[PDB]
Symmetry: D2
Subunit: 235 residues, 4 copies
């Protein structure tokens, strides 16, 4: 089955499957049940920015989410990604809606990956500060589309700008990413994306994710709403 590592911007408390009782950011290691969460004060309709960082020396996967002028939310978890993920992965963003909804709009997305073994590390770096209708270097899955106002729309939003329920969508970068190998000395990656989460009715759902998966990964069956498009069950 897929091997998934993710940072989840979890907008909807699913307390029956281990969510804390408040919107949160979490680190997910091959399970929707986050290994660590921090309370996240989502600001409806504002543009937020997420930064994620890892290196094989410290073996600490960190994420921070912030809005303008507001306090940040940070979460970290000590995990040896070398032992967890395959040597070759694809990187991506995912989002879902359920009975409740939200725009899962991505305004920009940047990613850097380095793999060392003399400074001769191998590196991959990409930055989308703007998305075009034909984004050939993105693999779109599910309901995700590109082009609308130069944005990446992970979940189904009707033409009026209203978000739809029970949507799922993902975008993976086209090239595969080399994140470890047998001989490896140091590896590190770094990811950032700006997002816009708007929900009209009382509360939004279900969230946005930055994730790392085996190269052939696609939306698992049953992965909607609270499973953020990454996992088939809630184990």
């Amino acid at each position: 089955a897929d091997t998934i590592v993710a940072v989840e911007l979890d907008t909807y408390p699913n307390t029956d499957i281990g969510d804390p009782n408040y919107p949160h950011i979490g680190i997910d290691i091959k399970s929707i049940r986050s290994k660590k969460t921090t309370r996240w004060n989502i600001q409806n309709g504002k543009v937020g920015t997420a930064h994620i960082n890892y290196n094989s020396v410290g073996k600490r996967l960190s994420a921070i989410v912030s809005y303008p002028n507001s306090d940040s939310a940070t979460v970290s978890y000590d995990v040896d990604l070398d032992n967890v993920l395959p040597e070759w992965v694809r990187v991506g963003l995912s989002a879902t809606t359920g009975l409740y909804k939200e725009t899962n709009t991505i305004l920009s997305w940047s990613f850097t990956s380095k793999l060392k073994s003399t400074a001769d590390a191998n590196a991959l770096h990409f930055t989308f500060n703007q998305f075009s209708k034909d984004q050939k270097d993105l693999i779109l899955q599910g309901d995700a589309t590109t082009g609308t106002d130069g944005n990446l729309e992970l979940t189904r939003v009707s033409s009026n700008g209203s978000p739809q329920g029970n949507s799922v969508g993902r975008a993976l970068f086209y090239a595969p990413v080399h994140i470890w190998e047998s001989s490896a000395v140091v590896a590190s990656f770094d990811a950032t994306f700006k997002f816009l989460i708007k929900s009209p009715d009382s509360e939004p759902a279900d969230g946005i994710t930055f994730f790392i998966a085996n190269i052939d990964s696609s939306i698992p069956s049953g992965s909607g709403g609270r499973l953020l498009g990454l996992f088939p069950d809630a184990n």
Copy 2:
């Protein structure tokens, strides 16, 4: 047919199809007949480095090739790549052998591409300082292989290290590259690679190329030897 822009490290004078009468670097715009060439003193069996640069403001495509301690060879040509290439391309290295031969060994390859329209340019950057036997982010065509001594071998070299005749090989980066669009303000790219050209008998052939092509490009039929794997005829 393919749309090809290339910088050729032309090791073998094909004077009957417009080569100058000496090894040369050239800028090729949709023809093997270089728009501009400079004399290039190849040093058999040495490691050389090539740097290529372009931006849409100056509209000048430049290349320099150098060996340690030795004088460099530089060539430039004013060309509006916006008007010449498609908006989406793939980037690559090619090499051939003919009746004469050479190792077309690539030790490293780095590439940067930026596309602007606030500093929010889109960017792609990759660096192979080392090639592994399974290089999933490279599309190998023809006789090109990866892994041997951490190198990219574009043309057929027998296990002993001897180069074979009438070989052709190319490697293109897996992700497509966005190099222009309708709205574009500025675009630029930058490429560098280290290569090792060894030939035992008197003189080598045929050369190495860095090239930019339509995404679906493959080795055209009839493109061996003097056509460096890029062109079907010598027009």
Copy 3:
């Protein structure tokens, strides 16, 4: 005397000292009389962005200035900066006002410099996306201040936000920049800055400059208004 290379955003036609009869961008090589100019439609009070690029292979210094949704203005000039500038320089922004005025406000400023001689080039890169009141890595000269709304104010603006006449100001990066040497193979630099030019009365003056100078350079006497803070006379 100082050795100055600059890209000038010349907002005020000084036709008596060789300006064209319209606001323009220009390339200045040790003289205020631009070696090449392009017509520039300044948009009062809008945020514009300038990109400048050079490399020692093509020997073509280019600049582009653009505003949102509007056509760009581009200018290029073939010049061998190796032969023109000293091996060690400082890089900076300058601006002036005269009898007419303008805000010469800098919102961001990024600069990259590379010097090569194996990919072992030397490099300097800095980015100010925000300026703080105590910007210790900037050398402020003349009327330039830092901090106001996170901006760099090159020329005197009164506390109300109104620009003052006969101001001059420059900011140079604190570290010296190594842009060539005897052994050099390739060198290149790249600079970008976002600026805000507002003038209330009919027309603004005098302009903004990105420049490269000998390390000890300061505002020459007599360099105000039309001499943009770079040159003592109009030769």
Copy 4:
């Protein structure tokens, strides 16, 4: 007094002041007595590479040191550098010798620093892959010299290539570095350097350091040998 954070490549066991009884890498937080050490198998006369990384989200300062083909040594320590260092610092390398000696030769040194508050982080990046006799962007202190074989020699080495006793030397980058501020959201830095440690007699001393200090820092009196040029006492 100076505020010092450093990663020490400690070649000589000073067990009387808390060193483990073997050469080690350590993380030093305002004391020569390392907060954490790892055993380091130094290879006399080989070229080694050190990588150091920190970010304000994970608050984990990591270092790895490796030689070709050999196992690496890694060390980490959870420390909130925001609370420890001043907002403005200088970054540098230091080295010493004592009764025993070693070449403290630096072949290359690269450093990246980012400070965020939209992707508009402030950044400083420099890379010396080669040092020239007149390195104007380095502040040399003590016995450190630049130019010899394109290398940075931190401690006194006689013209023959033999290392001298009771030497001390440091090099700091010329520009000050902005590593935090009141408004800050995220900060991170990253440093790498290649070094050559050769000692003829039985064992070398005393070590090499990458350090971060208040901008005006200089070699404290009494800081030789085992105090690696950073600290006046061994507290």
